[PDB]
Design a protein around this ligand. Structure first.
Ligand SMILES: Nc1ncnc2c1ncn2[C@@H]1O[C@H](COP(=O)(O)OP(=O)(O)O)[C@@H](O)[C@H]1O
Ligand SMILES: Nc1ncnc2c1ncn2[C@@H]1O[C@H](COP(=O)(O)OP(=O)(O)O)[C@@H](O)[C@H]1O
Ligand SMILES: Nc1ncnc2c1ncn2[C@@H]1O[C@H](COP(=O)(O)OP(=O)(O)O)[C@@H](O)[C@H]1O
Ligand code: ALF
Ligand code: ALF
Ligand code: ALF
Ligand SMILES: [Mg+2]
Ligand SMILES: [Mg+2]
Ligand SMILES: [Mg+2]
Lengths: 448, 448, 448, 72
DNA sequence: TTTTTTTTTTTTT
């Protein structure tokens, strides 16, 4: 047989130390748990100790024995005699921390051994599973294994370091001669004033009713970001084919009414402008488009990381749109499915340190009011969409609802939420023919 | 014991097939390589086959045997009889793609199993490797597996590739001088100016209140499409029998009061007209009607596929109407059921590259308003009907609501949504007696 | 054999505190009496002290032993050795309030058990008593327990008290305000009156819709508490990084527009203020902040206990926020998951004797009503959140829902539950620019 | 034990023909379903045959053998 | 147990 590696000595030394000195119990708790012990009796003893400590009862040779007898585990663990021997074996809890780390290492080693065993079985007995299923399983297991190594060293501890880290960041920004913009440059001056660009590690959201221009606005931000920096920008078009996205972006950049592009009725001047656009796009070559439909959060993470690894980071990620992503595990409760997707995307932004722009739809309840301007509570199926987002922008075009409105060809970007900035409204011009939003150079109206 | 996966018979078939026809060499070569086989002699044969192909020698039994004999590997792989048996068990060369695909799958599984065994070997014996290194090896191996796939799943695509495809599409659209109608001809020139025909891969929707002409308009679109092209058009009439539909079509095409047709009080001229219509329809023979009730999305897709396969493709398919379809799995929640149906209809359009015209009903909230023209948010039970649709046309006849209206017999096609294109209104004369919508020759009223 | 509940340590601690300090004997006597103990000798001792107080003689070891010896009770209570031991058990006389309350609580439980035993006795042997007699006896006993509690907020005030309060407060008002506060300072004088500060062992709750100052308010409480005491405070920020939290604190304490801090567009004057703030914080060094994500009730307890032991207790604990904690065991029923989380926090709060502030979200039903002020039924997934909470505060800002409202920059704190004291509304000024709340110095509108 | 009415020979002919040709799959899909077959072995083969067909893959002994092997 | 989206009927301002 292949006996998994273990060191019962470390477990026994820890157990004796806990029974001798209960103060050092934190040292054991911060490195190992009840399930890290190779021998099951140790696991039962640790669990009983945790229950007694949580009740305020001291961890000694009498209280632990009494608790085990009451719960009936005193027979399985061996009895008071086994606890007495553990007390004798351990000299003192002076070096308990070292033993705890060893037990943690053994427990980790047991876990990765089990994962290897599970993977081998799956390959030997796929039971009809396709290659992708095992691949994602391997990725998830690796992520789970690395999870214990993510945040397991330190907790709250210092404040001095917090001030040192914080003051350092202010100094770096202060020295950098930037014009207020600190994130990605949106491309619209009025929007940069309020948002100061798309900040890294943020979950931005764009919402509006159908055919308001959620994709038209989002692709404009993508184009501006690509032209105003160097890092790659990644697009997930779960709804429209890559070809249709390109025709819109080809009409916007070159300013050629997309009706001709779609229909092919182009003159010589239009061919000249389209050629100019193609030259610029192919010179940079930092835009990636993925038009696969129905992607799970795991697949989004996998493809985003791969692009970052190859090209040394990402600058922006666009998703179109939230509700189209799938989580097969939570396929019964739609509300829980949407909550899981939102949490994952926020985590992805923090992990890669890159703004994530995800579009969203709106409820019909908006359409039963006299004032049809969206509010935070309109997001569709939005369990936690409002609670997790760092910035929420709504697109409202008045002319859609009132044919006599004076605001003809004007769109309002309503900032519905912002954790670290003011909220308000920004007015832009909408040129549908070119699939473009432009700065509203016209007369400015103060926002109440 | 555990036997690593492999398909000896498939390995035999792939080897056997290419000896007859070598044109499929690229198909086999790109999909699979000599490393994919599990049996060494087969690897030797393919290695010889690739060498002969690279040398310009035709792939055949005689050339293979000669090369093996010269290299001395003929004894290892067998001989004239062994190689003859290789081709004997091949079912068909045309299928070689599946055999090659099978071989790739077996090799992929073997590769995964080997990686799992390698991971287990590394995990069981650290060999001086720390826990972090073991994580790195697992990550590297997983990435290699995801790297060896060679796409096969449509990952993110660079922008250079997308531009090449899009510009090619525009250039070819330039050559064909259709002058406005890129898709199926609707038959109403005022409607083509906006929609530019019914584009393939679209989910068109026609909605209106009961007895507004919803099935009368859709049938007019179907009749015009059938007479203006050559591909079959399929009709799913879940609401009315096939006889009633045909009774209307005879009245429309032949322009005979449908009351006489339904009642039988026909004259000589009416018989002459109907005979003329019958001759035309039987000359083309490209209309199919399926009046089964309560079809599920699966049955709709299966039947459409069969018609496309048998007759070389479809030109248009019409559904009457959306809300009558059933999804037995999701019957507790009507909102989820309708969302599932809408998604399926959009997916079907993409698969067959055909426009799908699905009718829909409207809410009663329209009837509590002073203005009774429909809007997007009136579609009945419509969770995602407004979001998935690429074009929404509403039928509104003002004479129904205001008796003294000036628009007596003038229907309006209100385009409530169009993803790629403008929105507006089109006026058509409504001849209910003939069950027909005609072009409105009257003065053009500018749309606001 | 079921042992009636009691608290021996509380009895011993109360006796020792009374022996040490005599001015607080009245408070203990009012809260608890001799009969409120569980052991007869301790009841005898309490009678001895009450007799001494009636005579006015000082209460201490010498006097207590003298009285016991004269009455012959010295041997009954174990002699002078146990008298000294009673004080030896007591850490200090100031903490006698909590111990007396425990003694009263056990006394109430004992009385309830006795009444229940009497009820069973009568029912088992009617002796001829009619059901009415049994029911009347049970009803009278229940009223005795319910009414024999004193406390406050137990009914409508009569006339004599009202008249004296009316004249007394009229006379006091025209001379001086005479504010008492007398509580664990929250920094806002108007809030101390209605809460008497944050009482230890409670489980305070703060709730509001997204982007309502929920985290801004909690941080202000943490800052004010830190300056006005010496015990360490702890923060569990499960949503925002420690950097962002610290940035807000610097803006709030130094009264500097936080947009400049985020963008780094500071000047010499602002840098002077920030430098002053950093000096004060580092002078104290009693704030600990943990930004680990997805903690569990076990993890927070272990970390909180470790901090307390290292530095000798915690003055306050803040969590942001409740719904983000995770319990893998109960990872199927969210309602049970939240129930366990709330229970664990309450257990920790009383175990350490430290106030615990936990934030929470609200449903979307609030926004459906015409009156948008929160209510206790709006807590999200509130299986037991309302039950365990000892104090609930809601944050409301009418300016959010009404641009023309006259309450611009005014936030209302709505107390929806409280163990002692009334429930009402507290007004404050919300300076979002500095991420701060300020006392509503303006015209204090009478609350209706 | 009264013999339930069933015809193995017809089932064997149907399964074999479908192996020979793929263009008649529609002819049998409407007429029969997996539950129609009497013996469980035939039911398993038809289910695998349908799974391959709806996947748009050719029908043959090798493909069927592998597909059945995948599910055990 | 909780959160979400759709219908239809009543009562009030
Ligand atoms: N050639 C054109 N002329 C005028 N308007 C157009 C043209 N092409 C598209 N539009 C308008 O632009 C809008 C863009 O819609 P879209 O970006 O799809 O919004 P969403 O992505 O939120 O559904 C549509 O409402 C459409 O009416
Ligand atoms: N002989 C006729 N004369 C006048 N109007 C007719 C005649 N036959 C049918 N119609 C009208 O045609 C309209 C459209 O019918 P239909 O297309 O079935 O409505 P929908 O399918 O939208 O429910 C009906 O309102 C009906 O009154
Ligand atoms: N510079 C600023 N000017 C005006 N308002 C601001 C500024 N900075 C922050 N705010 C406001 O302070 C509020 C604090 O939000 P926050 O406490 O994060 O919400 P939550 O209650 O969900 O924690 C935000 O709604 C934001 O609008
Ligand atoms: F067509 Al949409 F958001 F309504 F892309
Ligand atoms: F009669 Al209908 F749609 F209302 F065909
Ligand atoms: F901005 Al929040 F909870 F909505 F911190
Ligand atoms: Mg879109
Ligand atoms: Mg109809
Ligand atoms: Mg917050």
């Amino acid at each position: 047989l292949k006996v998994p590696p273990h060191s019962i000595e470390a477990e026994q030394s820890v157990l004796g130390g806990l029974m001798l000195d209960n103060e050092r119990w934190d040292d054991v708790a911060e490195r190992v748990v009840a399930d890290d012990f190779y021998t099951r009796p140790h696991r039962h003893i640790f669990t009983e100790m945790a229950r007694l400590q949580e009740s305020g009862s001291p961890i000694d040779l009498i209280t632990l024995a009494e608790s085990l007898e009451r719960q009936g585990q005193l027979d399985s663990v061996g009895g008071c005699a086994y606890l007495a021997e553990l007390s004798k074996n351990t000299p003192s809890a002076a070096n308990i921390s070292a033993y705890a780390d060893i037990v943690r290492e053994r427990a980790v080693v047991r876990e990765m051994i089990s994962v290897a065993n599970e993977i081998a079985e799956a390959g030997f007995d796929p039971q009809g599973r396709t290659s992708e299923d095992l691949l994602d399983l391997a990725e998830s297991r690796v992520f789970k294994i690395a999870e214990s190594r993510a945040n397991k060293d330190e907790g709250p501890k210092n404040i001095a370091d917090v001030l040192d880290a914080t003051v350092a960041r202010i100094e770096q920004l202060f020295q950098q001669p930037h014009d207020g913009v600190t994130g990605v440059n949106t491309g619209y001056d009025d929007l940069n004033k309020k948002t100061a660009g798309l900040q890294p590690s943020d979950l931005i959201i764009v919402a509006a009713r159908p055919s308001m221009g959620k994709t038209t606005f989002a692709m404009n931000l993508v184009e501006n970001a690509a032209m105003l920096q160097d890092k790659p920008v990644l697009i997930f078009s779960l709804e429209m084919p890559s070809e249709q996205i390109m025709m819109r972006s080809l009409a916007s950049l070159s300013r050629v009414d997309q009706t001709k592009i779609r229909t092919g009725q182009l003159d010589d001047e239009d061919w000249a402008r389209i050629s100019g656009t193609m030259g610029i796009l192919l010179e940079k070559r930092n835009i990636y488009i993925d038009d696969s439909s129905g992607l799970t959060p795991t697949e989004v993470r996998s493809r985003a990381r791969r692009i970052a690894r190859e090209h040394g980071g990402i600058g922006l990620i666009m998703i179109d749109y939230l509700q189209l992503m799938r989580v097969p595990a939570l396929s019964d409760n739609r509300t829980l499915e949407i909550a899981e997707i939102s949490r994952s995307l926020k985590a992805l932004a923090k992990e890669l340190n890159v703004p994530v722009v995800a579009l969203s739809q709106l409820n019909r309840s908006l359409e039963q009011r006299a004032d049809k301007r969206p509010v935070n509570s309109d997001l569709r199926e939005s369990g936690s969409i409002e609670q997790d987002a760092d910035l929420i922008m709504f697109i409202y075009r008045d002319e859609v609802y009132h044919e006599n409105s004076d605001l003809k060809g004007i769109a309002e970007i309503i900032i519905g939420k912002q954790r670290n900035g003011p909220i308000g409204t920004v007015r832009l011009t909408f040129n549908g023919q070119w699939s473009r939003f432009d700065n509203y150079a016209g007369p400015q109206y103060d926002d109440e």
